[PDB]
Amino acid sequence: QAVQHVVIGPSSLIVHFNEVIGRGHFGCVYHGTLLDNDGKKIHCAVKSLNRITDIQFLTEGIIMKDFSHPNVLSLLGICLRSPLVVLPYMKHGDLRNFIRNETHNPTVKDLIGFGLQVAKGMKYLASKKFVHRDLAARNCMLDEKFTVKVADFGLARDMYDKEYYSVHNKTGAKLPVKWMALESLQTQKFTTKSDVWSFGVLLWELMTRGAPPYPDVNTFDITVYLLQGRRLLQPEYCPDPLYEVMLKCWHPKAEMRPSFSELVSRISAIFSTF
């Protein structure tokens, strides 16, 4: 109820409804224009929540206001007036689309840096005891300054690409099966260590420039596949030490996996060497 420090004046926001920039299960995302404190016009992304009809409990992602880090998506505010969420505009869309685009030329070193940037955002989130539960290349955003923001959390949580989700049907939980840690597929619960397993998959996505993981393994078999110790193979252009980092993320023992803080050290070292 004490949300007032996040409310945006409706006469201070223009939502360009004719320009859908995204569609999630909870509602569309539009290009918008925001009048900032300094009185300057700024681009923004506005997310409508029209699908959620009854209940409000979603707004218990309001804790995202307290989050602040260059690699985590900030909340600009909410506009009441279907409640609307106002978020920064991300020039290059989701990380995975950006790298999949053949008219783009990210270098091998760009690709590793995107990876490090995510590692830093996850480091920050881990320390605030925040578990993401759906880290993947399609859920990171890339701004004009080519800064990666970890997204799809808090008021921005949604499915923007249902292709890779299963819906549990008993709990309604949305499960991105090919990004999920082994223990998660078995117990259906998520921890920082399961975020670390997903981060590994994210890395692999980067080095393949957004190839689909385990293309020849069907969704059912994925579990025995992992139980047998099979893992994603090294991409043609992934430096040996980086692949080594991926393997650590997928150790069958969660406690055995590196922290996000260790991942920041290792990737940063790799980013500088060569």
Ligand X SMILES: CN1CCN(c2cnc3cc(C(F)(F)F)cc(NCc4cccc([N+](=O)[O-])c4)c3c2)CC1
Stretch that binds ligand X, among 3-11, 33-41, 151-159, 193-201 (CB under 6 A): 151-159
Q: Which of 38, 54, 94, 134 is catalytic?
A: 134
Q: Rounded to 5 degrees, what angle do the CA atoms 138, 144, 145 make?
A: 105
Give every CB contact of residue 213 below 8 A, 6+ residues apart in sequence: 178, 179, 201, 204, 205, 232
Nearer to ligand X, 24 or 113 (CB): 24
28 binds ligand X (CB under 6 A): no
Nearer to ligand X, 158 or 183 (CB): 158
Stretch that binds ligand X, among 58-66, 109-117, 138-146, 190-198 (CB under 6 A): 138-146
Residue 22 assigned to a binding site: yes
160 binds ligand X (CB under 6 A): yes
Q: Across the strands, what pairs with 44?
A: 32, 88
Looking up tokens 């940063």, which residue turns up?
268
Binding residues for ligand X restricted to 41-80, rule: CB under 6 A: 45, 47, 73
Three-state SS string over 138-182 comes to: HHEEECCCCCEEECCCHHHCCCCCHHHCEECCCCCCEECHHHCCH
User: Under a CB-based contact definition with an 8 Å cutoff, are residues 74 and 67 in contact?
Assistant: yes
Q: Which of these, 237, 245, 248, lies nearest to 269 by C-alpha position?
A: 245
164, 193, 200, 233 from 215: Cα distances, Å = 12, 24, 17, 12
Stretch that binds ligand X, among 21-29, 109-117, 177-185, 197-205 (CB under 6 A): 21-29
Instruction: Read off the tokens for 114.
Output: 């995107």
For the chain, the distance separating the N- and C-terminal CA atoms, rounded to the nearest angstrom, is: 53
Out of 26, 30, 67, 89, point to the residue binding ligand X (CB under 6 A): 89
Q: Is there a catalytic annotation at residue 134?
A: yes
Name the residue whose CB lies closest to ligand X. Answer: 22
Residue 26 assigned to a binding site: yes
Binding residues for ligand X restricted to 189-228, rule: CB under 6 A: none
134 binds ligand X (CB under 6 A): no
183 binds ligand X (CB under 6 A): no
Residue 47 assigned to a binding site: yes
Q: Identify residue 150 by its one-letter amino acid code.
A: V
Stretch that binds ligand X, among 81-89, 103-111, 124-132, 198-206 (CB under 6 A): 81-89
Give every CB contact of residue 55 below 8 A, 6+ residues apart in sequence: none
Residue 25 assigned to a binding site: yes
Q: Footprint of ligand X on this chain (CB under 6 A)?
A: 21-22, 29, 45, 47, 73, 87-90, 93-94, 138-139, 141, 151-152, 156, 160
Binding residues for ATP, as ranges, are 21-29, 47
Binding residues, as ranges, are 21-29, 47
Question: So which residues are the catalytic ones?
Answer: 134
